[model samples]
Target: MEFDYVICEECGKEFMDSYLMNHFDLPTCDNCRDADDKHKLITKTEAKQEYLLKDCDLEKREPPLKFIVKKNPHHSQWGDMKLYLKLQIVKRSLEVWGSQEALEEAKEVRQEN
Candidate 1:
C-alpha cells in the first residue's frame, strides 16, 4: 500500500492520500474543506452583498504606481528611458497574457512554430 503526496488547492499545503483519491481530484485539507462547507452556509444574497461592498471599497482606492510614467521625476533622461522601457515591457506582458506561465507558453509556441 502506498500514498501519493498532494497539495491542497485552497491553502497550498501538502498532504498524503491514496493514489486513487489523489487521481480522482485535487483535494483540500480538512481545514479548507471545512471552511468551504461553512461558506456554503451563507445565503447567496449575503455573498453577493459582501462582494458588492468589496467592489465599492476597491473602486474608491487609488491603484498602485507601478505603471505610472514619470513616477521618478528626478531621474536623468537616460535613467527615465531605461525605467520606462522596463515598465512598458512588464505592463504589456501582463496586459496581453495575464501571467508569466501564459507568456512563457506563448514564447514556446512561437519558437516551436
Candidate 2:
C-alpha cells in the first residue's frame, strides 16, 4: 500500500519512504544518504558547545527542531541524551548568528579565551 511518495531534495527523486524520511520527515532517500557527513547525529552538548545553541534555540525556535532520545553512552546512571541532526543544527546556528561568518567568529572568540 502506498499513500504518498516523497521527493529526495538531495537527488531530486521520488521515493515512498526511508529511515530518515520516516523518522524525521527528511526527504532523503536511502540511496542519497550520506556517509554521515551531512546527516550525522550529535548530542545536545555538542550542539550547545559547537553550534553555540541553547535549549531555547532548539526548543523555542520557530518549529522547534526535532531530536531523538538515546541512552547515555558513558554510563547507565545518567539520563538519556537528546540528539539532533547536524544539518538542522547548522540551520539553527545560522538563524541565531545571522551568518556563517559570524558563527565562525563566535567560535573563534571562544577558542581564543
Candidate 3:
C-alpha cells in the first residue's frame, strides 16, 4: 500500500500522512507535533510564571543566556516574532524595573530594532 504525503503547517515540511502528520487542527511533523502537545498542556499561569522567572533572573544576571536561549527562541518571521519579543521585554522590564522605565525601555528597543 502507498501512503499519502502531507505538509506540516507549523514547520512547512513534508511528511508521510500515516507517520508524521496526525493532528486534525494542524498537520505537523513528529517534532512539531510533540512541541505543540507540550505547549498545549502548559497552563497560562505556568507560562506567565516561567516568563516572570526568566525576567527576574535577567534582572539579577544570575542565569546565563545559554540556558535561556535554548527553549525560548521561536522560529518565525521577524514581523511576527518581534511583536512577541517586544511584549516579553516590556513585561519583563515592568516587573523588574517599573512602569515608566519599562515603557522607556520598550520604546528604545523598538526604535533600535
TM-score of each: 0.25, 0.71, 0.24
Give me the candidate number with maximum lDDT.
2
Off by over 4 Å in 2: 1-3, 75-79, 98-101, 104-113
TM-score of predicted structure 3: 0.24
Instruction: Give the per-residue lDDT digits (tens) of candidate 1, residues 22-107.
Output: 33243555556542343122221222232222222222323311121223344345333211112223444454545567666666
Pitting candidate 1 against candidate 3, the one with the higher TM-score is: 1
- lDDT tens string, model 2, 1-113? 46267988889887788867766777788788763767776677777778777766677766556677777768543476777776778778888776688888878877899
The 10 consecutive residues of candidate 1 with the worst lDDT sum are 61-70
lDDT of each: 0.38, 0.74, 0.40
Worst 10 residues of 3 by lDDT: 63-72
Better of 2 and 3 by TM-score: 2
Show model 1 residue runs off by greater than 4 Å.
1-84
- Best-fitting candidate, measured by TM-score? 2
Candidate order by decreasing lDDT: 2, 3, 1
